[PDB]
Curated annotation (Swiss-Prot):
Binding positions for ATP per the UniProt entry: 65-72
Protein's job: Can catalyze the hydrolysis of ATP in the presence of single-stranded DNA, the ATP-dependent uptake of single-stranded DNA by duplex DNA, and the ATP-dependent hybridization of homologous single-stranded DNAs. It interacts with LexA causing its activation and leading to its autocatalytic cleavage. PI-MtuI is an endonuclease.
Subcellular location: Cytoplasm
Name the record gives this protein: Protein RecA
Species whose genome carries this gene: Mycobacterium tuberculosis (strain CDC 1551 / Oshkosh)
Superkingdom of the organism of origin: Bacteria
Length: 315
């Protein structure tokens, strides 16, 4: 472009940035502006796709997809890591599907996990709000949006008529919740299905993640887990529309080790030979699984690889 023109564009981008907050406009090629702390997701691939190395703090987040997609598994990792860094976590549950043992195996401090099973939608969000305004929570997860049924509808239509009262109930709540989240620095993840009040969440959220099962991972001829794909369809902290893939193993969750290998070869830090993954002259293993297993059994070298990937990308 011309220099006389670039002055006015930078002026305009700045006015947008100042008038409506940072992230209001971005070139898709732009670098991510790194926050102090974030909540990692369990996949380095996703952390990278998110730009800022994980989920932002003090913001609303939506993770969505069909049933048995992996959306909750991603949400639970966010919880696990938030706790691992000394944070308190809450789980606002209107579905009653949570598996604590799976959550444990994946990394959650279940004993410490605050859990609430509310009577109504407004109660769910009212409780979340009170839990947030304490300033003691790092992460709160709402499972799920579709289950936030209004009092009136639960009481036999006694008190309302509008079929879209639930959407109105989300809208009101999110307006008040938004201020509480930024002040507190608390992350709120709303889990949502594809198949009630997701229209407001779509605009209030700073990150929206589209989660999908892509392919089954087999052991000879038996189902071990699923190849998962996530597109960041909305991102107010870094350029949107990035996507990542990673493995969710039944009983164990997102393989951090698999995602390190994938991004290892993606960045040329891990080389091939003949189905042989190698690192810094040493060999990790023959085939994808042996390398994965090697990194599990050698956590020190897995961290070397994690460190070596972040530094190369800022993250
Ligand atoms: Na679960």
């Amino acid at each position: 472009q011309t220099p006389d023109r670039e002055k006015a564009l930078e002026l305009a981008v700045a006015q947008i940035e100042k008038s409506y907050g940072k992230g209001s406009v971005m070139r898709l090629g732009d670098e991510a502006r790194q926050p102090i702390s974030v909540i990692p997701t369990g996949s380095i691939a996703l952390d990278v796709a998110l730009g800022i190395g994980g989920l932002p703090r003090g913001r609303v987040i939506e993770i969505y997809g069909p049933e048995s997609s992996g959306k909750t598994t991603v949400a639970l990792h966010a919880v696990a890591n938030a706790q691992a860094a000394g944070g308190v976590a809450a789980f606002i549950d209107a579905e009653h599907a949570l598996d604590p043992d799976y959550a444990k195996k994946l990394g959650v401090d279940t004993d410490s996990l605050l859990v609430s099973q509310p009577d109504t939608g407004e109660q769910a969000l009212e409780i979340a709000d009170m839990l947030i305004r304490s300033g003691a929570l790092d992460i709160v997860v709402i499972d799920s949006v579709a289950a936030l049924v209004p009092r009136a509808e639960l009481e036999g239509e006694m008190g309302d008529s509008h079929v879209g009262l639930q959407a109105r109930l989300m809208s009101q709540a999110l307006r008040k919740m938004t201020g509480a989240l930024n002040n507190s620095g608390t992350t709120a993840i709303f889990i949502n299905q594809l198949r009630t009040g997701g229209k407001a969440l779509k605009f209030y959220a700073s990150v929206r993640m589209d989660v999908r099962r892509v392919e089954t991972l087999k052991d000879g001829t038996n189902a071990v887990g699923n190849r998962t794909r996530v597109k960041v369809v909305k991102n107010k902290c870094s350029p949107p529309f990035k996507q990542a893939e990673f493995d969710i193993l039944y009983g164990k969750g997102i393989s951090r080790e698999g995602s390190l290998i994938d991004m290892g070869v993606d960045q040329g830090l891990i080389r091939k030979s003949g189905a042989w993954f190698t690192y810094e002259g040493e060999q990790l293993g023959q085939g994808k699984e042996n390398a994965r297993n090697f990194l599990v059994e050698n956590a020190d070298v897995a961290d070397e690889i994690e460190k070596k990937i972040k530094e190369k990308l800022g993250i």
